[PDB]
Write a protein that binds this DNA or RNA. Structure first.
Length: 196
DNA sequence: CAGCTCTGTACGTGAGCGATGGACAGCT
DNA sequence: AGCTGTCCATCGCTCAGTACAGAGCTG
């Protein structure tokens, strides 16, 4: 990566972009190599996140990884990952890393209390639900989940990973439905708050 | 048996690598 | 014309979680 070795990137971490009063917190798995390289969320060609954010209308213009720090103030969106350690792919992380991550994540969500905790990847919500709700399904679906983050009003919403690794949603177009339904959920929650 | 957990297998796009060679212009 | 090197179009190729079957486990 411009003369930077994989070994160097594996030591890097990606900072959280979290504030209070957010509508949405996008929760990824862990930083991939390009995210570690750039120091920004979801850069590069192997990820559909920024394209889906625009295609769904969650952003009115096409944004990129460099705009990520403007998302709390301008768009009401923040970022974190379940696991801090950078790896090329999510299958390089251990179960203990995921469960340590899950514990750290629930504390962050209980502190920041966004309207919606968005699990950018079904695999991480599978782990999270088992750890936090003590619930294992048989058969986990995408979209809105039936449990709130403990001691909060924060909802859980799951989308297929924005990574272009999965073949079941091969294009950014195949994932936009979930971003549109996330936008609708946010608007419904804002609509309820106005009506008390 | 019947639900489970765990493990290994199989799967589509499209952006952008290095490699290759065609178009083309400078020079003689 | 003959030669050459650069530019850049284009190539083939790689690769950035999910679903599910079946083995193993347990009530």
């Amino acid at each position: 990566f411009n003369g930077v070795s994989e070994a160097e990137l594996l030591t890097k971490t990606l900072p959280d972009i979290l504030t209070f009063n957010l509508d949405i917190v996008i929760i990824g798995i862990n930083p991939g190599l390009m995210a570690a390289y750039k120091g920004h969320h979801y850069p590069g060609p192997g990820n559909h996140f920024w394209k889906c954010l625009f295609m769904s209308g969650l952003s009115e213009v096409q944004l990129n990884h460099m705009d990520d720090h403007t998302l709390p103030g301008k768009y009401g969106i923040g970022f974190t990952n379940m696991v801090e350690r950078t790896t090329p792919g999510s299958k390089d992380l251990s179960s203990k890393e995921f469960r340590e991550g899950g514990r750290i994540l629930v504390q962050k969500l209980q502190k920041y209390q966004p309207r919606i905790a968005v699990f950018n990847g079904k695999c991480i919500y599978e782990i999270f639900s088992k750890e936090v709700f003590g619930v294992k399904v048989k058969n986990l679906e995408f979209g809105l989940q039936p449990h709130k983050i403990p001691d909060t009003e924060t909802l859980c919403y799951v989308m297929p990973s924005s990574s272009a690794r999965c073949a079941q949603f091969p294009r950014a177009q195949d994932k936009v439905h979930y971003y549109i339904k996330l936008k609708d959920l946010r608007d419904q929650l804002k609509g309820i708050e106005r009506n008390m």
